[PDB]
Design an enzyme around this catalytic site. Structure first.
Site, PDB file in Angstrom:
ATOM      1  N   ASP A   7     183.128  15.997  66.811  1.00 55.99           N
ATOM      2  CA  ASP A   7     183.179  15.672  68.230  1.00 55.99           C
ATOM      3  C   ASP A   7     183.340  16.951  69.069  1.00 55.99           C
ATOM      4  OD1 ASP A   7     184.905  13.075  70.193  1.00 55.99           O
ATOM      5  OD2 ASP A   7     183.585  14.701  70.807  1.00 55.99           O
TER       6      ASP A   7
ATOM      7  N   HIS B 194     181.119  12.525  69.703  1.00 54.06           N
ATOM      8  CA  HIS B 194     181.846  11.665  70.617  1.00 54.06           C
ATOM      9  C   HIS B 194     181.262  10.257  70.644  1.00 54.06           C
ATOM     10  CE1 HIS B 194     185.098  11.212  73.318  1.00 54.06           C
ATOM     11  NE2 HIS B 194     184.356  10.930  74.371  1.00 54.06           N
TER      12      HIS B 194
ATOM     13  N   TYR C 295     188.923   1.648  80.034  1.00 51.88           N
ATOM     14  CA  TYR C 295     188.432   2.995  80.252  1.00 51.88           C
ATOM     15  C   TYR C 295     189.344   3.659  81.281  1.00 51.88           C
ATOM     16  CZ  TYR C 295     185.452   6.954  81.483  1.00 51.88           C
ATOM     17  OH  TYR C 295     184.964   8.207  81.765  1.00 51.88           O
TER      18      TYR C 295
ATOM     19  N   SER D 122     187.190   7.538  74.228  1.00 53.09           N
ATOM     20  CA  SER D 122     187.236   8.685  75.124  1.00 53.09           C
ATOM     21  C   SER D 122     188.438   8.629  76.084  1.00 53.09           C
ATOM     22  CB  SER D 122     185.918   8.789  75.879  1.00 53.09           C
ATOM     23  OG  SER D 122     185.866  10.016  76.562  1.00 53.09           O
ATOM     24  N   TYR D 123     188.204   8.640  77.399  1.00 53.92           N
ATOM     25  CA  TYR D 123     189.306   8.512  78.361  1.00 53.92           C
ATOM     26  C   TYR D 123     190.103   7.240  78.098  1.00 53.92           C
ATOM     27  CZ  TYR D 123     191.887   9.314  82.723  1.00 53.92           C
ATOM     28  OH  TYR D 123     192.866   9.560  83.645  1.00 53.92           O
TER      29      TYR D 123
HETATM   30  C1  LIG Z   1     178.842   8.014  80.963  1.00 53.42           C
HETATM   31  C2  LIG Z   1     179.740   8.521  79.843  1.00 53.42           C
HETATM   32  C3  LIG Z   1     180.484   9.808  80.205  1.00 53.42           C
HETATM   33  N1  LIG Z   1     179.869  10.749  80.968  1.00 53.42           N
HETATM   34  C4  LIG Z   1     180.468  11.903  81.329  1.00 53.42           C
HETATM   35  C5  LIG Z   1     179.689  12.870  82.192  1.00 53.42           C
HETATM   36  C6  LIG Z   1     179.711  12.453  83.668  1.00 53.42           C
HETATM   37  C7  LIG Z   1     181.118  12.238  84.214  1.00 53.42           C
HETATM   38  C8  LIG Z   1     179.022  13.551  84.470  1.00 53.42           C
HETATM   39  C9  LIG Z   1     178.947  11.145  83.854  1.00 53.42           C
HETATM   40  C10 LIG Z   1     181.759  12.182  80.913  1.00 53.42           C
HETATM   41  C11 LIG Z   1     182.440  13.478  81.318  1.00 53.42           C
HETATM   42  N2  LIG Z   1     182.454  14.427  80.231  1.00 53.42           N
HETATM   43  C12 LIG Z   1     182.416  11.242  80.131  1.00 53.42           C
HETATM   44  C13 LIG Z   1     183.797  11.542  79.678  1.00 53.42           C
HETATM   45  C14 LIG Z   1     183.999  11.990  78.373  1.00 53.42           C
HETATM   46  C15 LIG Z   1     185.294  12.276  77.959  1.00 53.42           C
HETATM   47  C16 LIG Z   1     186.365  12.109  78.841  1.00 53.42           C
HETATM   48  C17 LIG Z   1     187.761  12.414  78.398  1.00 53.42           C
HETATM   49  C18 LIG Z   1     186.162  11.667  80.146  1.00 53.42           C
HETATM   50  C19 LIG Z   1     184.865  11.385  80.568  1.00 53.42           C
HETATM   51  C20 LIG Z   1     181.781  10.049  79.769  1.00 53.42           C
HETATM   52  C21 LIG Z   1     182.495   9.014  78.922  1.00 53.42           C
HETATM   53  C22 LIG Z   1     182.075   9.108  77.475  1.00 53.42           C
HETATM   54  O1  LIG Z   1     181.523  10.164  77.089  1.00 53.42           O
HETATM   55  O2  LIG Z   1     182.300   8.119  76.729  1.00 53.42           O
END
Ligand SMILES: CCc1nc(CC(C)(C)C)c(CN)c(-c2ccc(C)cc2)c1CC(=O)O
Ligand SMILES: *[C@@H]1O[C@H](CO)[C@@H](O[C@@H]2O[C@H](CO)[C@@H](O[C@@H]3O[C@H](CO)[C@@H](O)[C@H](O)[C@H]3NC(C)=O)[C@H](O)[C@H]2NC(C)=O)[C@H](O)[C@H]1NC(C)=O
Ligand SMILES: *[C@@H]1O[C@H](CO)[C@@H](O[C@@H]2O[C@H](CO)[C@@H](O)[C@H](O)[C@H]2NC(C)=O)[C@H](O)[C@H]1NC(C)=O
Ligand SMILES: CCc1nc(CC(C)(C)C)c(CN)c(-c2ccc(C)cc2)c1CC(=O)O
Ligand SMILES: *[C@@H]1O[C@H](CO)[C@@H](O)[C@H](O)[C@H]1NC(C)=O
Ligand SMILES: *[C@@H]1O[C@H](CO)[C@@H](O)[C@H](O)[C@H]1NC(C)=O
Ligand SMILES: *[C@@H]1O[C@H](CO)[C@@H](O)[C@H](O)[C@H]1NC(C)=O
Ligand SMILES: *[C@@H]1O[C@H](CO)[C@@H](O)[C@H](O)[C@H]1NC(C)=O
Ligand SMILES: *[C@@H]1O[C@H](CO)[C@@H](O)[C@H](O)[C@H]1NC(C)=O
Ligand SMILES: *[C@@H]1O[C@H](CO)[C@@H](O)[C@H](O)[C@H]1NC(C)=O
Ligand SMILES: *[C@@H]1O[C@H](CO)[C@@H](O)[C@H](O)[C@H]1NC(C)=O
Ligand SMILES: *[C@@H]1O[C@H](CO)[C@@H](O)[C@H](O)[C@H]1NC(C)=O
EC number: 3.4.14.5
Lengths: 726, 727, 74
Positions: free
Chosen positions: A668, A700, A507, A590-591
């Site tokens: 997504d 997503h 991640y 994702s990331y």
């Molecule tokens: C807990 C999961 C999560 N929660 C969040 C929201 C907070 C940071 C407020 C918690 C985010 C921010 N949008 C992500 C996220 C999504 C995309 C990317 C490029 C980076 C981060 C994720 C990861 C996921 O959706 O898999």
């Protein structure tokens, strides 16, 4: 026998939970069967409270329920239609919780966006067509608070796409006063916010695909704007529209784009607001008292506390929330100290300087409860492990005398805790998440002794006896005099004189933690248990819970140190002598999808192959609130240079050395298909072959039962073939 | 030594040489050499340089294409070429004068011009810009605005909307000059209630938000564009007043419901023929319309109407065929299905009801290529009874039983597929030969019929290719219910019938398709056959064309049935042939072929190991109305809904568990929308079948970009190699 | 006419005029000012200013303005 793909996909070996919701300081509720029972702890007993078949003749299947704190009305939620991560739409019906007779008149309308009881009594607040409504009685006409509500443009009491995802992590933007007299709310204005547009194919009977249009501010675009209001729910004539008192942001905030990033009541008559500058390295907190003679709210300029950051952004994801002493003249909040570590500060409302009630090379994770004697909090101090969670109890009268609570209740089974407190903390629940099987135990904070086992998960334990389960390492490696933590999912009957293939599970995004003490039955469990693949995750630069020094390391510099540290990780693992160098894979969602992409893009030649699910491809495509926090603006005078240096597209030529699988859901709404569309196009143009998979109408999560099943099957086929696995 | 490899095919190693000439008079044509454009004398060849390639560089743009005025005074210059659909595009235009020496600078043709055309003689211009029609009597003068109604994506004057471009006119143009450029006839299309297909276009990585492209596109059963027809008189254009256009309304039987304008042909200087087609495409009407001075209006007399219908199927191959008027315009020739179901030349009189047929037989006329006063010239597949051959024939008008094959005998080994370019009064003709041997371009006289010269014999290509181990093509038939059905096979070099070869079935199988022919090709198959030793075969079963209506109308109202079964039966006959590895038989196709492939993969036949579907139709409600409805009728309870319902590939998802599948589609496919493949993938996910996907960002139906062309074939090549266990 | 009051933000380097410090002067009977809106005379601390404006009888008098309150007193 082993833990198969079908085991993960069909959830054969199920983790048992103990979800409880405290109605009072004494009793909690639990769904044990299909129906709801009331539990105690004072003499210990329990009684049956209500059935899902008291509303069998209701006609519908209830998605959720809600108790009115006074205990007189139940709110039934059905007709659930999901929107984004938290946002959704439902139908609601109310019962006279005593007589269990449906409240027939002045019904809460279909297509309601949010609903919430006052913290005491049985007042309602709901949002319907972007407007706020209030019901003092569950059978009286609603009183319409807002009139500005317009679909996709003005949100009263609910968040827009970005405030939902990144700022509040919730749909609602409503906050009742402690005793239910005042209702605060945010109002978001999306007028000039650009829309992301994508096709929705729908059921095959839909002849022409729908185009979904979400107002969504990508990095650098016109953000939403926000106003904040408070309304008095008592004095509320029907003869005249209800007047709502505004609270403007402070001067230092009105001077440029900003976000409303925290709402916390203090007393019946005191509210606190934290505002964030668009460049998220400056944040301000206002404390605002009510004026009985004015009808207005006044926030004293001297009372403004400032949270700054010169090494990085502020907070972990957003500035930390305050917890107020009962008088409301003082609050505690988790902040970063002079040398990186995030600890609890005791602020005196009427000045500027807190003093730290904690110090040291470990961060506090969150404040869980406050009594006028002690302060309860979770941290990663125990055994200096950042991946562990334990509950601590600090004495307010003496800050040096800090007694632990969870740490040693069971050291081997239990290194990762969370806590749900009763309504005044007379009792508390402990969720132990691992590294043994989850354990749920009810304690009294009276004499801090354990009362009983709620769930010891022995059921699951017993059918895991004749399964060859994966083992789990959790240890550090030193890099440039720094402890960096990794975890490994080791196959059963592990043999370190053998050479196992390895999947790097990444991640790696800002303030992440993939290496913890949490116990999991996931895809990695199958990979190790069946395919004898080691699955490892490494917390490198930019990960969390280790201080600002490690976390801020990637500031304005995404796609660098966290990418590079993932490669170095593999080098370390392989050079532990039990890894087949020739068979090392990498993957993430994702990331993590972005990082995997970046690594396969780096040309280090460690990685044979890799999977990227819903990856980011270039940061300009992702949303402002998240992206700008760690990147800034994509303008020539800020960081446009590095936005360019971090795209995966720019590294297309390098994917010639790797086998690559790229997956993305077409619907997504978060990480847009676009991002993967640009990766694939970039790859085509340099003439590199790769594998692809779109998922029609998945978001997503790619979380449809069948899509989930499909993506994991597909990836298993990919990883096995890459690994020459039969 | 070596073979025909993938890079060979992809990098265009062994090029094929064409001879792209343009007739300008009756004895002269134009070709390009060192890029210099030269005029040739057909009789002699004492060719002089017409316009050397040094005249247009400092002028400073990119000369994409050009066009001379028919009188030879003015050259139109095309630049800033930006493609729309299959034919439609947009460009800037500059006019260049030969006589006055230099280029024109005043009253210039707009940027973003939709279409441009000269009058058929002289040097008039008619162009469309912003959906409106303009006329230049003189290239240097202001233009007279013909139409004030054109509105983007809604009212189309003199250009066609999406469906009319792709499906009816196979052109962006809706402009027809009268023979001597006096009248300008045009169509106006209305798309007001035509729904829009919407899709994401992603563009350069620099575009931050994806653009939503939106296109008026009638899917099966959807509201269609409407059509009106007009004729304006260009000689009487007044600067002081707005130019009036005279409407020719469709006949009564056509207005009685939705319809189409299918054909426009000028007959004489003052006579136009228009063919209309009912939305149910089995009934069509030709109107002959004459100008009348004392009224000013146009009259299409009822007594001069000509009905062309079908009870077995639709009318025409894809559209009712075009008339060929005798010089005097009192009579015309046209290809129509006869009583036997075979398409032959019928001679019609304007002022009479019945025609008389002047060809017959168990074969079909492909096209009438020229009509003088002594000879009808036509291409048919009569020769040797090969429906996959094309030769040139002349009918001696004075006695239509006297017919001569002009191309059959010229070179029967090398050449059996032909096309023809006639000079303006058919004094000369270019003969293109496309197979089975290397292409051959020859120039001919009509008087003697003597071959004059070889224009291009591809000897340059022949040279290299005799070192390469090239596949043979076998063209043959199999008998199914005393009916011949033809196939071709691309056979690996040194083909051994003792050996068991993996087979790839190359499929189109659309209505009136023909995959088995004598054309020489250098394609992906050439690589598969030569390098990988895969037998690739194609087969024209029921529904296929140029073999009569019985075969062609066999799939009427019943798409995704017989043409699918006949593909499965083909492979069966191919196994049964003895030189085919049962365990390695794959199938692949594009467009309709992709639909058939998918339909075969979901069939449960178990003949086929694996398949590749490129931009497939998934269900017929998703495709455009005029193509689909021609074969399927309307998707209603009253017409053919149940079959629309049974003929989707989605309903066969479960069966894909039985095959290895690769599903490929371009995201900016405006034709068969990416939707169709999105619904396939979704249906497959829902029943838990594993397949392979590939989307191509921003590519359209042809997946035609240089890099994307290479990518898709490389990708497919890997899929096929794995499925066949090839290293 | 609108009087904007703008502060130099130290961390910014930029100047900012908050909408709540905007002061409006208009006239229904003619033009604003004798020949132009009147110049403000600020108290030393910057928080208050005096200004000649037309009163509700059309007579030009010295009004006392606070930076935050819309209404002055003559
Ligand atoms: C807990 C999961 C999560 N929660 C969040 C929201 C907070 C940071 C407020 C918690 C985010 C921010 N949008 C992500 C996220 C999504 C995309 C990317 C490029 C980076 C981060 C994720 C990861 C996921 O959706 O898999
Ligand atoms: C959400 O933000 C919008 C701006 O992005 C607000 O809309 C703006 O409000 C103005 C007043 O309603 C609009 O029009 C102005 O009206 C005044 C009346 O006297 C005229 O003088 C101005 O000339 C006129 N301005 C123009 C350019 O027409 C703004 O135009 C308008 N901007 C928009 C819609 O883009 C929304 O009101 C706001 N919503 C809420 C409730 O906060
Ligand atoms: C294009 O088609 C539309 C119909 O789809 C025509 O618009 C109609 O105009 C008439 C006026 O005579 C009205 O009575 C109808 O209400 C209109 N229909 C709609 C829904 O727009 C229009 O006439 C056509 N345009 C041209 C150039 O002929
Ligand atoms: C020769 C190319 C071509 N030309 C045409 C146009 C005419 C039939 C009028 C000539 C069509 C009709 N749209 C198609 C076609 C496309 C999709 C489908 C489902 C069926 C037929 C193709 C096939 C292709 O695009 O590859
Ligand atoms: C909501 O659903 C339908 C409207 O289509 C109707 O039967 C019902 O009365 C509605 N109920 C409420 C709570 O408004
Ligand atoms: C409240 O406000 C709206 C619009 O601002 C108005 O139309 C409505 O009549 C008002 N209702 C009452 C009760 O004053
Ligand atoms: C078209 O484009 C070119 C370049 O923008 C310009 O020189 C010309 O004046 C434009 N317009 C016309 C009328 O051709
Ligand atoms: C011709 O018609 C147009 C549109 O109907 C009208 O606006 C104009 O007056 C006419 N053009 C000229 C310049 O005579
Ligand atoms: C063109 O045809 C029209 C109509 O027949 C006629 O008026 C005219 O004489 C012709 N012009 C020339 C130059 O042939
Ligand atoms: C016989 O007729 C056709 C010949 O075209 C053949 O393809 C089919 O298999 C047979 N039909 C039936 C129903 O027996
Ligand atoms: C926050 O970040 C910027 C950009 O790097 C930096 O110059 C400064 O330390 C902070 N800016 C402000 C206005 O507080
Ligand atoms: C300013 O003058 C305009 C035009 O004379 C008039 O409409 C209006 O009454 C005046 N506006 C104000 C703010 O007095």
């Amino acid at each position: 026998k082993t833990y198969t793909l079908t085991d993960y996909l069909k959830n054969t070996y199920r983790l048992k939970l103990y979800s409880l919701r405290w109605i009072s300081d004494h009793e909690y509720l639990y769904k044990q069967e299909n129906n709801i029972l009331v539990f105690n702890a004072e003499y210990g007993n329990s009684s049956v409270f209500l059935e899902n078949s008291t509303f069998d003749e209701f006609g519908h299947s209830i998605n959720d329920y809600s108790i009115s704190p006074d205990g007189q009305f139940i709110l039934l939620e059905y007709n659930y239609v999901k929107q984004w991560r938290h946002s959704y739409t439902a139908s609601y019906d109310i019962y006279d919780l005593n007589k269990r007779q449906l409240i027939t008149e002045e019904r809460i309308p279909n297509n309601t966006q949010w609903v919430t009881w006052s913290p005491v009594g049985h007042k309602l607040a709901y949002v319907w067509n972007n407007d706020i409504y209030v019901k003092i009685e569950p059978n009286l006409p609603s009183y319409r608070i807002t009139w500005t509500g317009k679909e996709d443009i003005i949100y009263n009491g609910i968040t827009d796409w970005v405030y939902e995802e990144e700022v509040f992590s919730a749909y609602s933007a409503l906050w009742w006063s402690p005793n239910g007299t005042f209702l605060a709310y945010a109002q978001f204005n999306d007028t000039e916010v650009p829309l992301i547009e994508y096709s929705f194919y729908s059921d095959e009977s839909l002849q022409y695909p729908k185009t979904v249009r979400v107002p969504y501010p990508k990095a650098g675009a016109v953000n939403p704007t926000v106003k904040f209001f408070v309304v008095n729910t008592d004095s509320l004539s029907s003869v005249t529209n209800a007047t709502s008192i505004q609270i403007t942001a402070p001067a230092s905030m009105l001077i440029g784009d900003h976000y409303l990033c925290d709402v916390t009541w203090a007393t019946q008559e005191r509210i606190s607001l934290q505002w964030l500058r668009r460049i998220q390295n400056y944040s301000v907190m206002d404390i605002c008292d009510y004026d009985e003679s004015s009808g207005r709210w006044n926030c004293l300029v001297a009372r403004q506390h400032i949270e700054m950051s010169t090494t990085g952004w502020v907070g972990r994801f957003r500035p930390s929330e305050p917890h107020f002493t009962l008088d409301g003249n003082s609050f505690y909040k988790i902040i970063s100290n002079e040398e990186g570590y995030r600890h609890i500060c005791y602020f005196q409302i009427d000045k500027k300087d807190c003093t730290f009630i904690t110090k040291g090379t470990w961060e506090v994770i969150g404040i869980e409860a406050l009594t006028s004697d002690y302060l309860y909090y979770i941290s990663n101090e125990y055994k200096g492990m950042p991946g562990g969670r334990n509950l601590y109890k600090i004495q307010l009268s003496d800050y040096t005398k800090v007694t632990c609570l969870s740490c040693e209740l069971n050291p081997e089974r239990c290194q990762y805790y969370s806590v749900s407190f009763s309504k005044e903390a007379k009792y508390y629940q402990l969720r132990c998440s691992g590294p043994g099987l989850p354990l749920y135990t009810l304690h009294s904070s009276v004499n801090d002794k354990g009362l009983r086992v709620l769930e010891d998960n022995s059921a699951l334990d017993k059918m895991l006896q004749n399964v060859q389960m994966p083992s789990k390492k959790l240890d550090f490696i030193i890099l440039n005099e720094t402890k960096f933590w990794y975890q490994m999912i080791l196959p059963p009957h592990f043999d370190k004189s053998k050479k196992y293939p390895l999947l790097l599970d990444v991640y790696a995004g800002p303030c992440s933690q993939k290496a913890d003490t949490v116990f999991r039955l996931n895809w990695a469990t199958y990979l190790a248990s069946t395919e004898n693949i080691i699955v490892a995750s490494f917390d490198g630069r930019g990960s969390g819970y280790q201080g600002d020094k490690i976390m801020h390391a990637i500031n304005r510099r995404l796609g660098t140190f966290e990418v590079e540290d993932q490669i170095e990780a593999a080098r370390q693992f392989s050079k532990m002598g039990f890894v087949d160098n020739k068979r090392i894979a990498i993957w993430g969602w994702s990331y993590g999808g972005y990082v995997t992409s970046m690594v396969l893009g780096s040309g280090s030649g460690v990685f044979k192959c890799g999977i990227a699910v819903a990856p980011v491809s270039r940061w300009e495509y992702y949303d402002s609130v998240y992206t700008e926090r760690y990147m800034g603006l994509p303008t020539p005078e800020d960081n446009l240079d590095h936005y360019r240096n971090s795209t995966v597209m720019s590294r297309a030529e390098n994917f010639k050395q790797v086998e690559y699988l790229l997956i993305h859901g077409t619907a997504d709404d978060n990480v847009h298909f676009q991002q993967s569309a640009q990766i694939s196009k970039a790859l085509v143009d340099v003439g590199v072959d790769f594998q692809a998979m779109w998922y029609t109408d998945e978001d997503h999560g790619i979380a449809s039962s069948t899509a989930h099943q499909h993506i994991y099957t597909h990836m298993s086929h990919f990883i096995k073939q890459c690994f020459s696995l039969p």
